[PDB]
């Protein structure tokens, strides 16, 4: 009721383009069409492929009146035991960051300007029998940041070698 939404990935219906770095090697915009409605997600799953440091940054969001924003994530993480021999290079977490700016820097992404909010861990991993039966465990996690002081902000997601699908990213403030 009293919430004002500033960013909503799933409501955009695949139309938000989030920046990825390194380009073409990590996070990817995916779709699933097994229901009446298409489902979109940002996914990465380079679990047995050497060290990973894959970044995904949102579009610029004008904060307006918001002083404190609340960030709600919905996501799946596959069990590292789904991947044979990967008990060393496979992870089940990813990291959430943000940055404030008075202008949209566009494709200029400088990870050095971003502040870490938290490591995001799944309450429930999706095990192989789930995945193979098309029955994922969707996690829901919320964080907040503030006071905000510039005109707008970005969120970013860092993958360190997990098998993660981001299905919902909703940012709001309370009026």
């Amino acid at each position: 009721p009293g919430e004002v939404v500033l960013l909503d990935f799933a409501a955009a219906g695949g139309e938000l383009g989030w920046l990825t770095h390194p380009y073409g090697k990590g996070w990817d915009l995916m779709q699933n069409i097994m229901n009446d409605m298409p489902i979109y997600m940002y996914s990465v799953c380079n679990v047995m492929s050497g060290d990973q440091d894959n970044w995904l940054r949102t579009n610029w969001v004008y904060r307006g009146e918001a002083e404190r924003i609340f960030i709600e994530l919905k996501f799946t993480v596959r069990d590292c035991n789904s991947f044979p021999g990967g008990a060393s290079s496979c992870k089940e977490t990813f990291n959430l960051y943000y940055a404030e700016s008075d202008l949209d820097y566009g494709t200029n992404f400088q990870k050095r300007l971003f502040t870490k909010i938290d490591t995001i861990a799944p309450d429930e991993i999706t095990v192989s029998s789930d995945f193979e039966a098309r029955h994922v465990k969707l996690n829901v996690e919320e964080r907040s940041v503030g006071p905000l002081t510039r005109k707008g902000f970005y969120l970013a997601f860092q993958d360190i070698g997990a098998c993660v699908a981001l299905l919902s990213v909703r940012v709001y403030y309370k009026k």
């Binding site: 779709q31 699933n32 069409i33 489902i39 996914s43 799953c45 679990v47 596959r78 993660v164 699908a165």
Partner: peptide, 11 residues
């Protein structure tokens, strides 16, 4: 490996 079942790149 796929992070999500029956998902394909969207572009």
């Amino acid at each position: 490996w796929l992070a999500y079942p029956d998902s394909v790149p969207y572009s």
